[PDB]
Design a protein around this ligand. Structure first.
Ligand SMILES: CO[C@H]1/C=C/O[C@@]2(C)Oc3c(C)c(O)c4c(O)c(c(/C=N/N5CCN(C)CC5)c(O)c4c3C2=O)NC(=O)/C(C)=C\C=C\[C@H](C)[C@H](O)[C@@H](C)[C@@H](O)[C@@H](C)[C@H](OC(C)=O)[C@@H]1C
Ligand SMILES: [Mg+2]
Ligand SMILES: [Zn+2]
Lengths: 148, 251, 13, 1340, 187
C-alpha cells in the first residue's frame, strides 16, 4: 500500500531514482502499521515513540555504565520530570495467555462479581425484619416512610 | 480480566478475531482503492487463512501465539478432546460440600459406621448448624450464628452432634473401578484429622493404610438421603455384582 | 508444481 | 584415630580390605563449571572455545575486522546472602577486549587504523556456589545432567513388524551435534533409499549423482569386474576359482585338457581346492551363460562412432553378436551373487530416473522445498549448505571419534563436516551388513549413550547468543560507515544475556532444589535424566529404554529409580562412577598381573570393559594377591561363568561400587527383595529433620561421607585450638605450623541459625566442640540439620515388637506409645513466610495504618503503632499480622439498608479492609519481620527502627572482627618486633601502639617501619571505606516492581507434633500410618516392666520378603544390650580398668575383621569420654554386601546377656497375662516422612467459583471442591441413584439460582431443590453456535 | 540364564545374583505401570458402547434361548453345569434321562435347591434364556436377563445393566497380561 502511494506521488522531473522515494514511503507505512495494530490494548503513536526513545537511552546507559540505569538516572539524563517515566514504565506491558501451563493459568481465575449466599440470605432476613417493623407502626406513617 | 499488579490475562480467541478483522478491513480498503489484482488475490488468500485458523487451527500451518511458541487455541479445540467441555465440565464437574483426608483403621466400629473428624463435619455442615441455631433461639440473626460458629462455643458442638445424628455421608476412593467404590456410612464424631474406615470394607475399596486418602460428600435433599440409606448403605452391599460371592470376607 | 500450501511461497512465485 | 572419630568409634564388621576410598561426591557439578569458566591458553572447552569459534567477524570484503583479544569476569555486586534476601540472581559481569581494524581501499594490506575498545560489557553469567547450586531469583537451583544418544553413525534393523513377512530391513543413520539428519534404508524389493532428516523417500543413487559421479564410476565403486575375451571362439572367459564357491556348475568347467568340473554337478569345496592347486585361470563357456550378465562401462564403435551399448545394460545374444562384430574382444561385467554379493546398486540405478548432476540436484531441491520453481544456483547452494558447510553442520570431536571407530579407521581426528568418502563408506558398511557380514548395534548400550552437564549446556547457550550478535554486527559493519564507530556501539549484550537467562531461569533441567535432608541434596546433585530438551518424552519411551542393561554394572544404580510414570528414566549415579573426557561413564578396576592382584587402578568404559574378563569383588586372597581357589567367578561379555585362575585380567575395587549412596545407606541390603529395596531407597530422602537427631545404632559406614561432603556441617580448614565457643560463632587459633609469613590472624566460623529451607523445614547449626579443645584439619565443628557429631541421622531408633494388637495394626498401620510423644522424639519445626503488598489503585494508594474499621481492640492488641505485629508474639489462625485499608466509594446501598442507616444514623466507611491474617488452623510464633519501601516514599517508624538495628549490628560485627584480628595481629607484631633488638621489658611496658612509632637511628629497618606505618594508615582508610559502603548499601532504596509501594514479610515458626494419620517408615521399604497413641500402662511389657515403644504387624514380612528388618532388629537389640551393660557399669563407677577391659572385649568380638583398636588411648580422659558416649548403645557398621552374619549377631547377643534366640516373653498391659509364643523385640531406626496429615485435611461447603464456567475452583490454597469424575457418575448409575446424581451435577456445582435457593432452603429447615439447567451447557451451545452450526432446543 | 540363584534371603545374595534379580523386578514394575492405563481405556470403551441398556419390561414371552452344558476339555472339566446354569430361567421344560418325566417345569428361576436337584439326577444339558435372544425392543426383560445380583431375587424393572456389565468386565483388567495317540484317564 505504501508503494502504491509512492508511485501515485512521484515526480520524475527531479531526476532522482524512484527507489529512494519508494523505500521512504514503504518504511513509513510499515512502521505506522506496526505501531497501530500490533498490541492487544492499543496505545497511541506518541506513547510508542516515547517508549522507543526510553529503551534506546536505557540500552546506551547500560552499555556505558556497566550495571543498569535506574529510573532516577533515566529522568536526569532525559529532560522529563521523572514521573512520566514511571507512567511509561507502567503502561508498556502485554497481556498473558490463559492457556499457559501450570492445569492452565485460566483454571485459577476467580469470579469476583458474584454474591455470597450468606449475603443474599442476610438481605432477605433484613427485608423480612423491616417489613415486620414497618407493620408495627401506624398505617399512614408506614406509607409515608415507604414513599420517602 | 486484570491480574494483581496491572498485568492482564486474555484468551486466544481475542487474537484470532483481531487478526480476522484486520485482514477484512485491509481487504475492504484495497477494494475501494482499485489495486492491481495480484495484491487483491494475496489479501483474499490471507483472509481465507485467517478465518480457517480461527475456526479449526492446526490444519494448514498452526499459527503460533505471539510472545510464545505454543499454537493458539481455536474454537474447535475447546469442544473436543479430553480437556474439552464434553469431558472436562459436562461429565466431570467439581462439587460443593466435600472434603478429603487420610484414612485410619478404627477396629471398634460397626459395619455401618465411619469416624468423621469434628472440624471436617463442622465445615461440611455449617448451613444446617446456622438453621438449627436460629430455630432454637440461641442466635437472633444469621450473622450472630456465623459469629457463634466461628468462635466455637459449646452449644455449637451440641447442635452439630444433634444434626449429624442420622445423616449419612458418602466415601469414595480415587480409582473407582466398580460401583462398590462409593458407599454410605453414618458418621461418628471423633477428635483428630484422619478418617476411620471399618476393616471389612477395605477389600471392596481396595484400600490399605499406608498413605491412602478418601473423599467425603454430603447428600443434601431428602430423597438423596433416602437413596443413600436404602441403596448405597454399607450393610446393603454384601455380594459382588459380578458374581454372587460375598465381598466382606475377613482378610 | 508440488502443490504447496504456504501462501508465502505462492505469493513469491 | 582422629578427634571427632575417637570421641565415638563405630564397631565395624566387614572383612574385605579397602583399596580405593570414596571420592568427593559432588565432583560432577564442580568439574563441569570449572571447565566452563576455565580461563585457558589454548582454545578448548570453556568460553574461550566459543569466542575463538565466532570471532573474528569479517565484513563483505569491506576491509575492516572485529577481532577478539581476551576476556575477564568482574566481581559480583551482591554475595549469596544479599541475592537471596532481595531476590536477584548471583552472577558476575563479563568484560571482553575487542580490537577493530579497518583496511583502506585500495592498496597492499596494512594497518590503516585499529581502535582498541576496552572491555565491552557482554551480558552476565550466573555463578555456582561452593556446593554446586545456583541462586537464580533468590532460590537455589540444580542443573541435573542429561543422558542422551551420542553423535555418530548407527546401524539398526527395523526387524519384525515391517510387512509381516520377516525380511529384516536394515538402515543407517548419521546423527550430528548440529545439523540435519541423513538416513539410508532398504525395502522388500532390495532397493537402497535415502531420506533427508524426515522428508519423503528417494533412490539412494540420487545423492551419489549429486556428488559428481557417473554411472561407470558408481559401478566401479560398488562392484567387482569379470574379465571377458573372445580368444578366437566360444567366449574364453577369465575365471578366478575363488569366486566359484557356493554355486552349482551348469557346464563342463575344464582346463589344461582336463575336466575339473562336469556338467550337472555343482561346484564344491573339493572342486575349488583342485582349481586353486592347479592354477586354472581361463576357461571356455557358451554364449547362453553370458546372456544374462550386466555390462560395466558403455561401449561405442570406433568406426561408426555410435554408442553400441550403455553402462549397466542387461546383455543379450544380439548385443553380444554386435559387440563381437564391431571389433570388441574384451567386455567387462559385474560380479553378482545371490548370497554374498547382491546387486542392489544396479537395481537402484535401474529405478533411478535422474541422469546427470543437474537433474539430481533439481530432484533434491524439489523434494526439500516443494511448490516453488528451482534454479541451478539455488539448488547448488542448498545442497552445499546441507552437509558440507562449516556453519550449518558440525558433528563433534566425540561425533567424529564415534564415526571413525564405527567405520574401522585408525584416526580419531578430522573435520566436522561430511565428505564423499564418509557417505561412500556408510553405504558400503550398510551393504556389507545386508550381505551377512557385520552386525547391528543396540541403542541402549552405555557405549552409545553420552552425558551432558552444566558447562556444556551453558556454552551452547552462549554460542547461540554470540551467533546472533555476530550476525547483527557484521550486517551493521558492512552496511554503515567504518571510520569513527567505536567497538562498543556495534555490540548489544541483550541477546547474549537473554539466551543465558532463558536457559538458567526457565528450563526443564534447571530445577528447584530438593532440600529435605543432606541426603536429598546429595541425590539431587548426582542425578541423570533421559528427559528434557533433546531427550525422550514421558509418554513415548517404551519398554526397552527403561530396563537394566548389562552395561550398568558399576555406572548406574539398578534399584534407585522413581516408581511413577518415569521409571527407568532418571537413574541416579553410582558411587565410584566417573565421566570420560568425552562424556562416557567409567568405573575403576584393580589390574591383575600374571597371578598377583596389584593395587593400580584403571578406569574402563563399557567398550573397553567388554573385551577383558573381570573377576568378582568378593574373591578370596591370601596376603600375596593370589586367588586362593583355582576357579574364580568372573564376567566377560554380558555374561558370567567360572574361569581359570590364570585368565583373570581385572577385579572389582569394592563390594559397594554397584550401588549408589542412597541405596548404600541401607544395612542388610542383600536380604531384601528388589522391589522393597527400591521403595526404601526412594523413601529415605523424604525424611524430615527432627528436633534432636541422635544416630543410627545399626549403620553401614557411609554416614560420615554424606554428612561431610554435603555442605551442611562446618568443617575446619586449618588445625588449631578452639579459643571461643558460642551458640553463634567459633574462633580457632591456628597452629604455628600452618600460619603464613604475615597476618597471623585467626579463623572465625559464623553459624547459621534458624532459617527457612526450600521445603519450609528448619535449618540450624550448633557448636560441636568446647573451649580449649584441639581441632585438626578436616574436623567437624558444627552439626547441621540432622547430623550427630559429623554423622548423618535422618530418623530415630525405637523399641519395637512384632505382634498383632487388637487390630490397631491391621493393614500397614502402626501403633505408637505415649512416651514417644511425651519425649518429643518426632517433633519438627516448620517456618512459613507471609507477605503483604501495598499497591497503588486508581482511586488512591493503599495504607498500612493500624486503625481498621469495625475491629475491636482485641485484634489490635498485638499490633504496634505503625500497624505491624511485634516480634515474639504468639498468633493463632485469624489474627491480624499487618494492617491495611483499601479506598472505596459509591457502594449504592439498598433501600432497606438506607432505612436502617436513617434509623440508627450509621456512617459508611470509605476504606475497605484487606489486612494480612494468619491462615486458619496454624498457630506459631513471629520470629522475623522485613520491610521494603520504594524509593521516594516516606519510611514508617518500624522501617527506621529496623534499619537502625541493622546498622548497629553491622558496625558491631565489623568492630568484633577487627578486635579479634587485631589481637592476633598484635601477637604477630610482637613476634616481628622481636627482631632488630630483642627487649622483653620494652614489650611488657611499651603500649601496643608505641611499638611502631619508635624509630631507629639509621638502617633499612627505619624504611620498613615507615612502610608499616603507611600501610596501617591505608588499612584505616580502607576499613572506613568498607564501613561507609555497608551503611550506604543498608540505607539505599529498594528496586520493586511497578505499582508497589511497600512490602512487609512475616516469618512464623510452627511446632508439629506426632498424631494419628502421620506417615512413618523404615529403611527397608516398610511404610505405615499411625493408628493410635496408646497410654504407657497399656503397652506390652517384659519381665522388668519396661514397655515397648512401637508394635508392628508380623504379617507384612512374609508376603513382601524384606528380611533385612528382622536382622536389623536383632542387631539393634544386641547393640543396646552392650550399651546398657556399659551404663550400669558406669553408674556404680567401678574403675577405669573394668571399663577398659569390657570395651576392649566388645570391640574385638569378631570373625577375622579389620577394626584394630587400642590400647593406645589417653590414660582415663579419653576412655571415660568414649564410655560416656557409648553408654547409650554401641554403634555398629554393616557394609552392604559385606555385613555381619548370624553367628556374629548371636555372639554379640550373648556378650550382653541377652537370649540368643532373639525373642523374649511379654505380658499384657491391661490384663496382666503373658502372651504365648515369645515375641520378637528389638531396636529399629525409623523415619518421619513429610506426608503430614495437617497438610492433607480439607473441607468446604461454599466458596469462590470459576469465571467462564461457574464451578467451584478445585484446589487447596483456595477451598475447591472434590472432583466428581465420570467414573463416579458410572458408579452412581450402577445404583438407581438419580436424585443424588442430579443434585451432584446441578445444584452442588453449576446451577446459580439453584445454588442460592438450595442454600436458603437448607437454612430455613426445608430440604428440597429446584434443579434448573447448568451453565456449562449454555456455554457449550454458544461455543458450538459461534461456528457455522445452528444447535437449538426444540419443544413439542 | 543357565545358572540359578542358589541362595535364599535367610542367607545373603552376592552382587551378581542381586544384579540378575533387579532385571525382573524392574520389568514387573513397568508392566504394571502401563497395564493400568491400558485397562482404563478398554473399560471406558466398554461403558460407552452399552450405557443405554435398561430393563424395560417383565416378560417378552420368547420360546428360545441358549443350550448350557459344562465346559469339559481334555481329561478334566473346567466348569461344572451348576455354576453355569444357576440363576438363569429355563427356556423349556427339562426332562430327566427317563422320558416323559418333567423334572423341572418351564421357565422358572433356578436357585440353590433346583440346582442341587439337577445335580441329584443325570441332567447334563439344559436350555436357558439369554439376553441376546430377547424379543423386547428398546431394552430387555427381567426373565431373559435372569437373577444374578448383589441381591438374590430376580432383576427389578428399571435397572441399568449395561453399566454394571461393563464395570464387572473391566474391573479385573489390571490382573491380566507329536502326541500321535490319545489315552483315556478314567474307566
Ligand atoms: C522445572 O522442574 C520441573 C520440570 C518439569 O519438566 C519435565 C517435563 O521435564 C523433567 C526432567 C528433565 C526431570 O529430570 C524430572 C524428574 O527428575 C522428576 C519428576 C517428578 N517429580 N515428582 C512430582 C511430585 N511427586 C510428588 C514426586 C515426583 C519430573 O516431572 C521431571 C520432568 C518434567 O516433568 N523426579 C525427580 O526428580 C525425583 C526422583 C524426585 C523429586 C524430587 C523433588 C520433589 C523435585 O526435584 C522438585 C523439588 C522439583 O525439582 C521438580 C518437581 C521440578 O519442578 C520444579 C518446581 O522445578 C521438575 C523437575
Ligand atoms: Mg496405599
Ligand atoms: Zn425377554
Amino acid at each position: 500500500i505504501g508503494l502504491m502511494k509512492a508511485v501515485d506521488k512521484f515526480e520524475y522531473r527531479r531526476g532522482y531514482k524512484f527507489s529512494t522515494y519508494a523505500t521512504w514511503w514503504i518504511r513509513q507505512a510499515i512502521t505506522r502499521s506496526i505501531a497501530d495494530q500490533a498490541r492487544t490494548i492499543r496505545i497511541p503513536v506518541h506513547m510508542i515513540e516515547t517508549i522507543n526513545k526510553l529503551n534506546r537511552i536505557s540500552r546506551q546507559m547500560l552499555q556505558e555504565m556497566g550495571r543498569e540505569p535506574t529510573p532516577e538516572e533515566l529522568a536526569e539524563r532525559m529532560l522529563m520530570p521523572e514521573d512520566k517515566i514511571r507512567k511509561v514504565l507502567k503502561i508498556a506491558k502485554e497481556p498473558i495467555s490463559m492457556e499457559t501451563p501450570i492445569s492452565h493459568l485460566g483454571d485459577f481465575i476467580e469470579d469476583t462479581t458474584l454474591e455470597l449466599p450468606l449475603d443474599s440470605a442476610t438481605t432477605e432476613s433484613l427485608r423480612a425484619a423491616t417489613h415486620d417493623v414497618l407493620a408495627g407502626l401506624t398505617a399512614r406513617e408506614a406509607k409515608v416512610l415507604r414513599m420517602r | 480480566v486484570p491480574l494483581d499488579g496491572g498485568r492482564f490475562a486474555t484468551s486466544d480467541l481475542n487474537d484470532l478475531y483481531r487478526r480476522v478483522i484486520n485482514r477484512n478491513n485491509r481487504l475492504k480498503r484495497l477494494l475501494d482503492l482499485a489495486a492491481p489484482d495480484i495484491i487483491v488475490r494475496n489479501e483474499k488468500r490471507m483472509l481465507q487463512e485467517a478465518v480457517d485458523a480461527l475456526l479449526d487451527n492446526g490444519r494448514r500451518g498452526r499459527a503460533i501465539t505471539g510472545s510464545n511458541k505454543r499454537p493458539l487455541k481455536s474454537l474447535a479445540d475447546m469442544i473436543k478432546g479430553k480437556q474439552g467441555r464434553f469431558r472436562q465440565n459436562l461429565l466431570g464437574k467439581r462439587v460443593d460440600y466435600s472434603g478429603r483426608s487420610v484414612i485410619t483403621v478404627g477396629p471398634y466400629l460397626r459395619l455401618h459406621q465411619c469416624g468423621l473428624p469434628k472440624k471436617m463435619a463442622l465445615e461440611l455442615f455449617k448451613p444446617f448448624i446456622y438453621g438449627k441455631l436460629e430455630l432454637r433461639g440461641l442466635a437472633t440473626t444469621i450473622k450472630a450464628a456465623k459469629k457463634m460458629v466461628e468462635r466455637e462455643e459449646a452449644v455449637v458442638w451440641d447442635i452439630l452432634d444433634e444434626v449429624i445424628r442420622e445423616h449419612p455421608v458418602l466415601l469414595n476412593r480415587a480409582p473407582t473401578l466398580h460401583r462398590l467404590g462409593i458407599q454410605a456410612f453414618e458418621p461418628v464424631l471423633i477428635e483428630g484429622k484422619a478418617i476411620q474406615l471399618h476393616p471389612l470394607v477395605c477389600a471392596a475399596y481396595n484400600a490399605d493404610f499406608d498413605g491412602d486418602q478418601m473423599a467425603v460428600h454430603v447428600p443434601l435433599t431428602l430423597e438423596a438421603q433416602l437413596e443413600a440409606r436404602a441403596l448405597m448403605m454399607s450393610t446393603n452391599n454384601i455380594l459382588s455384582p459380578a458374581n454372587g460371592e460375598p465381598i466382606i470376607v475377613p482378610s | 508444481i508440488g502443490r504447496t500450501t504456504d501462501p508465502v511461497r505462492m505469493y513469491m512465485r | 584415630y582422629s578427634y571427632t572419630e575417637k570421641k565415638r568409634i563405630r564397631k565395624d564388621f566387614g572383612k574385605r580390605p579397602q583399596v580405593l576410598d570414596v571420592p568427593y561426591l559432588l565432583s560432577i557439578q564442580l568439574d563441569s563449571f570449572q571447565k566452563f569458566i576455565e580461563q585457558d591458553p589454548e582454545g578448548q572447552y570453556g568460553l574461550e572455545a566459543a569466542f575463538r569459534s565466532v570471532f573474528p567477524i569479517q565484513s563483505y570484503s569491506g576491509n575492516s575486522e572485529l577481532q577478539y583479544v581476551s576476556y575477564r569476569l568482574g566481581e559480583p555486586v551482591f554475595d549469596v546472602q544479599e541475592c537471596q534476601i532481595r531476590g536477584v540472581t548471583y552472577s558476575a559481569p563479563l568484560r571482553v577486549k575487542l580490537r577493530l581494524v579497518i583496511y583502506e581501499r585500495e592498496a597492499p594490506e596494512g594497518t590503516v587504523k585499529d581502535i582498541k575498545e576496552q572491555e565491552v560489557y557482554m551480558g552476565e553469567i550466573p555463578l555456582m556456589t561452593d556446593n554446586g547450586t545456583f541462586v537464580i531469583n533468590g532460590t537455589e537451583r540444580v542443573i541435573v545432567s542429561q543422558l542422551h544418544r551420542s553423535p555418530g553413525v548407527f546401524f539398526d534393523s527395523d526387524k519384525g513388524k515391517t510387512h509381516s513377512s520377516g525380511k529384516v530391513l536394515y538402515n543407517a543413520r548419521i546423527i550430528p551435534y548440529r545439523g540435519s539428519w541423513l538416513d539410508f534404508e532398504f525395502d522388500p524389493k532390495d532397493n537402497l533409499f535415502v531420506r533427508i532428516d524426515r522428508r519423503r523417500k528417494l533412490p539412494a543413487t540420487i545423492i551419489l549423482r549429486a556428488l559428481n559421479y557417473t554411472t561407470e564410476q558408481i559401478l566401479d565403486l560398488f562392484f567387482e569386474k569379470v574379465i571377458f575375451e573372445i580368444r578366437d571362439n566360444k567366449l574364453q572367459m577369465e575365471l578366478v576359482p575363488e569366486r566359484l564357491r557356493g554355486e552349482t556348475a551348469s557346464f563342463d568347467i575344464e582346463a589344461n585338457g582336463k575336466v575339473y568340473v562336469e556338467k550337472g554337478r555343482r561346484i564344491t569345496a573339493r572342486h575349488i581346492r583342485q582349481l586353486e592347486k592347479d592354477d586354472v585361470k581361463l576357461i571356455e563357456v557358451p554364449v547362453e551363460y553370458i546372456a544374462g550378465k550386466v555390462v560395466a562401462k558403455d561401449y561405442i564403435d570406433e568406426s561408426t562412432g555410435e554408442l553400441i551399448c550403455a553402462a549397466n545394460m542387461e546383455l543379450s545374444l544380439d548385443l553380444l553378436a554386435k559387440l563381437s562384430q564391431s571389433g570388441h574382444k574384451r567386455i567387462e561385467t559385474l560380479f553378482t551373487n545371490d548370497l554374498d554379493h547382491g546387486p542392489y546398486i544396479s537395481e537402484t540405478l535401474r529405478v533411478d530416473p535422474t541422469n546427470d548432476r543437474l537433474s539430481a540436484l533439481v530432484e533434491i531441491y524439489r523434494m526439500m522445498r516443494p511448490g516453488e520453481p528451482p534454479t541451478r544456483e539455488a539448488a547448488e547452494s542448498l545442497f552445499e549448505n546441507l552437509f558440507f558447510s562449516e556453519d550449518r553442520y558440525d558433528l563433534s570431536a566425540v561425533g567424529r571419534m564415534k564415526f571413525n571407530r564405527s567405520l574401522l579407521r585408525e584416526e580419531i581426528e578430522g573435520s566436522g563436516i561430511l565428505s564423499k568418502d564418509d557417505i561412500i563408506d556408510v553405504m558400503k558398511k550398510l551393504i556389507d551388513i545386508r550381505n551377512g557380514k557385520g552386525e547391528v548395534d543396540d541403542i541402549d548400550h552405555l557405549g552409545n549413550r553420552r552425558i551432558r552437564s552444566v558447562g556444556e549446556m551453558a556454552e551452547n547457550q552462549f554460542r547461540v547468543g554470540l551467533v546472533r550478535v555476530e550476525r547483527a554486527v557484521k550486517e551493521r559493519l558492512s552496511l554503515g560507515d567504518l571510520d569513527t564507530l567505536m567497538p562498543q556501539d556495534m555490540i548489544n549484550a541483550k541477546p547474549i544475556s537473554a539466551a543465558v537467562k532463558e536457559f538458567f531461569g526457565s528450563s526443564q533441567l534447571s530445577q528447584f532444589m530438593d532440600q529435605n535432608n543432606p541426603l536429598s541434596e546429595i541425590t539431587h546433585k548426582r542425578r541423570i535424566s533421559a528427559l528434557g530438551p533433546g531427550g525422550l518424552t514421558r509418554e513415548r519411551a517404551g519398554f526397552e529404554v527403561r530396563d537394566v542393561h548389562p552395561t550398568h554394572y558399576g555406572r548406574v544404580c539398578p534399584i534407585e529409580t522413581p516408581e511413577g510414570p518415569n521409571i527407568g528414566l532418571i537413574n541416579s549415579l553410582s558411587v565410584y562412577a566417573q565421566t570420560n573426557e568425552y562424556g562416557f561413564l567409567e568405573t575403576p578396576y584393580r589390574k591383575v598381573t600374571d597371578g598377583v592382584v596389584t593395587d593400580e587402578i584403571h578406569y574402563l568404559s563399557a567398550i573397553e570393559e567388554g573385551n577383558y574378563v573381570i573377576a568378582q569383588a568378593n574373591s578370596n586372597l591370601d596376603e600375596e594377591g593370589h586367588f586362593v581357589e583355582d576357579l574364580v567367578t568372573c564376567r566377560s561379555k554380558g555374561e558370567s561363568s567360572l574361569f581359570s585362575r590364570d585368565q583373570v585380567d581385572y577385579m572389582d575395587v569394592s563390594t559397594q561400587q554397584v550401588v549408589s549412596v542412597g541405596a548404600s545407606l541401607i544395612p542388610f541390603l542383600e536380604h531384601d527383595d528388589a522391589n522393597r529395596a527400591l521403595m526404601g531407597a526412594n523413601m529415605q530422602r523424604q525424611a524430615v529433620p527432627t528436633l534432636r537427631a541422635d544416630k543410627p545404632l545399626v549403620g553401614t559406614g557411609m554416614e560420615r561421607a554424606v554428612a561431610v561432603d554435603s555442605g551442611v556441617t562446618a568443617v575446619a580448614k586449618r588445625g588449631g585450638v578452639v579459643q571461643y565457643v558460642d551458640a553463634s560463632r567459633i574462633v580457632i587459633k591456628v597452629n604455628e605450623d600452618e600460619m603464613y609469613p604475615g597476618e597471623a590472624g585467626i579463623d572465625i566460623y559464623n553459624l547459621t541459625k534458624y532459617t527457612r529451607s526450600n521445603q519450609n523445614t528448619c535449618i540450624n547449626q550448633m557448636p560441636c566442640v568446647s573451649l580449649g579443645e584441639p581441632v585438626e584439619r578436616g574436623d567437624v565443628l558444627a552439626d547441621g540439620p540432622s547430623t550427630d557429631l559429623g554423622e548423618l541421622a535422618l530418623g530415630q531408633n525405637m523399641r519395637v515388637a512384632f505382634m498383632p494388637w487388637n487390630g490397631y495394626n491391621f493393614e500397614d498401620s502402626i501403633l505408637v506409645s505415649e512416651r514417644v510423644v511425651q519425649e518429643d522424639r518426632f517433633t519438627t519445626i516448620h517456618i512459613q513466610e507471609l507477605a503483604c503488598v501495598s499497591r497503588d489503585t486508581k482511586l488512591g494508594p493503599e495504607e498500612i495504618t493500624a486503625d481498621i474499621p469495625n475491629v475491636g481492640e482485641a485484634a489490635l492488641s498485638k499490633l504496634d503503632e505503625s500497624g505491624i505485629v511485634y516480634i515474639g508474639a504468639e498468633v493463632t489462625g485469624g489474627d491480624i499480622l499487618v494492617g491495611k485499608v483499601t479506598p472505596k466509594g459509591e457502594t449504592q446501598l439498598t433501600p432497606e439498608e438506607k432505612l436502617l442507616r436513617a434509623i440508627f444514623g450509621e456512617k459508611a466507611s470509605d476504606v475497605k479492609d484487606s489486612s494480612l491474617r494468619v491462615p486458619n488452623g496454624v498457630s506459631g510464633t513471629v520470629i522475623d519481620v522485613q520491610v521494603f519501601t520504594r524509593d521516594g516514599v516516606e519510611k514508617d517508624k518500624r522501617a527506621l527502627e529496623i534499619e537502625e538495628m541493622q546498622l548497629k549490628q553491622a558496625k558491631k560485627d565489623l568492630s568484633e572482627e577487627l578486635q579479634i584480628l587485631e589481637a592476633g595481629l598484635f601477637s604477630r607484631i610482637r613476634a616481628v618486633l622481636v627482631a632488630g633488638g630483642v627487649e622483653a621489658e620494652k614489650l611488657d611496658k611499651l603500649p601496643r601502639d608505641r611499638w611502631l612509632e619508635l624509630g631507629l637511628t639509621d638502617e633499612e629497618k627505619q624504611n620498613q617501619l615507615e612502610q608499616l606505618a603507611e600501610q596501617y594508615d591505608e588499612l584505616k582508610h580502607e576499613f572506613e571505606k568498607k564501613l561507609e559502603a555497608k551503611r550506604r548499601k543498608i540505607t539505599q532504596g529498594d528496586d520493586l516492581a511497578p505499582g508497589v509501594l511497600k512490602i512487609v514479610k512475616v516469618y512464623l515458626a510452627v511446632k508439629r507434633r506426632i498424631q494419628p494419620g502421620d506417615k512413618m517408615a523404615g529403611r527397608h521399604g516398610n511404610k505405615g500410618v499411625i493408628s493410635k497413641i496408646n497410654p504407657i500402662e497399656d503397652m506390652p511389657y517384659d519381665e522388668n516392666g519396661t514397655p515397648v515403644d512401637i508394635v508392628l504387624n508380623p504379617l507384612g514380612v512374609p508376603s513382601r520378603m524384606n528380611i533385612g528388618q528382622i536382622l536389623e532388629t536383632h542387631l539393634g537389640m544386641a547393640a543396646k544390650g552392650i550399651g546398657d551393660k556399659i551404663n550400669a557399669m558406669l553408674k556404680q563407677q567401678q574403675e577405669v580398668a573394668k571399663l577398659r577391659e569390657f570395651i576392649q572385649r566388645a570391640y574385638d568380638l569378631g570373625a577375622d575383621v579389620r577394626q584394630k583398636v587400642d590400647l593406645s588411648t589417653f590414660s582415663d580422659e579419653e576412655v571415660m569420654r568414649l564410655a560416656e558416649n557409648l553408654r547409650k548403645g554401641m554403634p555398629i557398621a554393616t557394609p552392604v554386601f559385606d555385613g555381619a552374619k548370624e553367628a556374629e549377631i548371636k555372639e554379640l547377643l550373648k556378650l550382653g546377656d541377652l537370649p540368643t534366640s532373639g525373642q523374649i516373653r511379654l505380658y499384657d498391659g491391661r490384663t496382666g497375662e503373658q502372651f504365648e509364643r515369645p515375641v520378637t523385640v528389638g531396636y529399629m531406626y525409623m523415619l518421619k516422612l513429610n506426608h503430614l496429615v495437617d497438610d492433607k485435611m480439607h473441607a468446604r461447603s461454599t466458596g469462590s467459583y470459576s469465571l467462564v464456567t461457574q464451578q467451584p475452583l478445585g484446589g487447596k490454597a483456595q477451598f475447591g471442591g472434590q472432583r466428581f469424575g465420570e467414573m463416579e457418575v458410572w458408579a452412581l448409575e450402577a445404583y438407581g441413584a438419580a436424585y443424588t446424581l442430579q443434585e451432584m451435577l446441578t445444584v452442588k456445582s453449576d446451577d446459580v439460582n439453584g445454588r442460592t435457593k438450595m442454600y436458603k432452603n437448607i437454612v430455613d429447615g426445608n430440604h428440597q431443590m429446584e434443579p434448573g439447567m447448568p451453565e456449562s451447557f449454555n456455554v457449550l451451545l454458544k461455543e458450538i453456535r459461534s461456528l457455522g452450526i445452528n444447535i437449538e432446543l426444540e419443544d413439542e | 540364564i543357565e545358572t540359578p540363584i542358589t541362595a535364599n534371603f535367610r542367607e545373603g545374595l552376592n552382587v551378581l545374583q542381586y544384579f540378575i534379580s533387579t532385571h525382573g523386578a524392574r520389568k514387573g514394575l513397568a508392566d504394571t505401570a502401563l497395564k493400568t492405563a491400558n485397562s482404563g481405556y478398554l473399560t471406558r470403551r466398554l461403558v460407552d458402547v452399552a450405557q443405554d441398556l435398561v430393563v424395560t419390561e417383565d416378560d417378552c414371552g420368547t420360546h428360545e434361548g441358549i443350550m448350557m452344558t459344562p465346559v469339559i476339555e481334555g481329561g478334566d472339566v473346567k466348569e461344572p453345569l451348576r455354576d453355569r446354569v444357576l440363576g438363569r430361567v429355563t427356556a423349556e421344560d427339562v426332562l430327566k434321562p427317563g422320558t416323559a418325566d418333567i423334572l423341572v417345569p418351564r421357565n422358572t428361576l433356578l436357585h440353590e435347591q433346583w440346582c442341587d436337584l439337577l445335580e441329584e439326577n443325570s441332567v447334563d444339558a439344559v436350555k436357558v434364556r439369554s439376553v441376546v435372544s430377547c424379543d423386547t425392543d428398546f431394552g430387555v426383560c427381567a426373565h431373559c436377563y435372569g437373577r444374578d445380583l448383589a441381591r438374590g431375587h430376580i432383576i427389578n424393572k428399571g435397572e441399568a445393566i449395561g453399566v454394571i456389565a461393563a464395570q464387572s468386565i473391566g474391573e479385573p483388567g489390571t490382573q491380566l497380561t507329536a502326541e500321535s495317540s490319545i489315552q483315556v484317564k478314567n474307566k
